[PDB]
Amino acid sequence: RICTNCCAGKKGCKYFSDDGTFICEGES
Amino acid sequence: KACTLNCDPRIAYGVCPR
Numbered sequence: 001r002i003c004t005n006c007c008a009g010k011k012g013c014k015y016f017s018d019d020g021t022f023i024c025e026g027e028s
Numbered sequence: 029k030a031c032t033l034n035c036d037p038r039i040a041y042g043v044c045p046r
Contacts, residue, residue: 002036009036013044023039 006012006024015024036042 005034007034
């Protein structure tokens with residue numbers, strides 16, 4: 001689950017945190 | 029498809045399709 005990168009985290013897929021606090025538009 | 033690793037330092041929910 002936690003290991004870094006938007007394949008499931010930061011820079012690749014869209015991303016929300018905990019509640020829904022955005023972090024990566026799958027490339028950010 | 030998927031990844032051997034690659035999975036957020038602290039992120040949680042993700043939406044690859046848009």
